[PDB]
A paper describes a structure:
We have described herein the reactions and the structure of Pgp3, a Csd protein of C. jejuni. This enzyme turns over the cell-wall peptidoglycan by both the d,d-endopeptidase and d,d-carboxypeptidase activities, as documented by mass spectrometric characterization of the requisite reactions with synthetic cell-wall fragments. The Pgp3 monomer is structurally divided into four regions: the N-terminal domain (NTD, residues 21–95), a flexible linker (residues 96–147), the LytM domain (residues 148–259), and the C-terminal helix (residues 260–273). The Pgp3 LytM domain contains a highly conserved tetrahedral Zn2+-ion-binding motif (H168xxxD172 and HxH249).
By using the H247A mutant variant, we successfully solved two structures of Pgp3 in complex with a pentapeptide (1, Ac-l-Ala1-γ-d-Glu2-mDAP3-d-Ala4−d-Ala5) and with a crosslinked muramyl tetra-tri peptide (2, NAM-l-Ala1-γ-d-Glu2-mDAP3-d-Ala4−mDAP3-γ-d-Glu2-l-Ala1-NAM). In the presence of the crosslinked heptapeptide (tetra-tri peptide), excellent electron density was seen for mDAP3-d-Ala4−mDAP3. The importance of these two complexes is that the scissile bond in the peptide substrate was seen bound within the active site. The tetra-tri peptide fragment (mDAP3-d-Ala4-mDAP3) mainly interacted with Pgp3 via its two terminal mDAP moieties. Tyr129, Arg195, and Tyr215 of Pgp3 contributed to the binding by forming several hydrogen-bonding networks. The hydroxyls of Tyr129 and Tyr215 were bound to O7 and O8 atoms of mDAP3 (from the donor strand) via hydrogen bonds (3.0 Å and 2.5 Å, respectively). The NH1 atom of Arg195 formed a salt bridge with mDAP3 (from the donor strand). The O5 and N1 atoms of the other mDAP3 moiety (from the acceptor strand) formed hydrogen bonds with the backbone nitrogen atoms of Val243 and Ser244. Importantly, the N1 and N4 atoms of the two mDAP of the tetra-tri peptide are responsible for linkage with the Glu2-Ala1-NAM moiety, which are solvent-exposed through the channels A and B, respectively. When we superimposed the structure of the H247A variant of Pgp3 in complex with the tetra-tri peptide with that of the WT complex with citrate (closed form), it was clear that the penta- or tetra-tri peptide cannot enter the active site in the closed conformation.
Author numbering: 20 to 274
Amino acid sequence: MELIKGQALFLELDKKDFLSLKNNDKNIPTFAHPKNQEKILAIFSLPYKNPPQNTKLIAFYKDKKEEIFIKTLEGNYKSEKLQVENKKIFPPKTIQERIAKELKEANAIYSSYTPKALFNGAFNIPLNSFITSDFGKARTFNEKVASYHSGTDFRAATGTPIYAANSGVVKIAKDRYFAGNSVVIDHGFGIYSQYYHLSKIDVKVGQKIKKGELIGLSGASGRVSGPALHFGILAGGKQVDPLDFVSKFNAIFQL
Ligand SMILES: [Zn+2]
């Protein structure tokens, strides 16, 4: 198989006598195929920055092992050469501490795995606008990726209502350094949607949220380039192309 870096794919496997799916020593969770009672699914994601060239997963069955080869593709992302090498910025200690604390908190959430569906059918887009900055726009130095846009930006004047892309449980709902006013929702199966730079947060941590339910108002918090809605998806432990993921997810769980 082939998969572009920074995207997810849904792996389909036989359910009968399946024991475990592994990437080296890392276990990949499985969930039911909603349409084919003899299949299960798993989400495999490749990181945008510095992915392996190839991946081999082993599905262990009671009587066999089944290998799965995945070749990484570079894709056709927009990319611009950085010019200033000076990358190690030097923030004040008070900012370094906040950054480090919010990163620990987020990683604890994104590493967690809810082993049931909290979603309800297909994902919807969080507002009926248009993309002004695509996922995966990269800045490169040393023929390597120095940074990239880890979500997609929708056009939104400050104060535009933002709605949950799918049902789930709010896990983050506060102001964070790079994301500004942030909402993160657990949809189950390690799938999280992200709503950043809001001007107003209308949900609390732990709250159960319905698809299409108001979660806040867009803004420009934490954002230098003015008002927009940054929408992200984390799945398989990685930030992935959100509209690509939604398209792949909806093809399976639509009906
Ligand atoms: Zn963005």
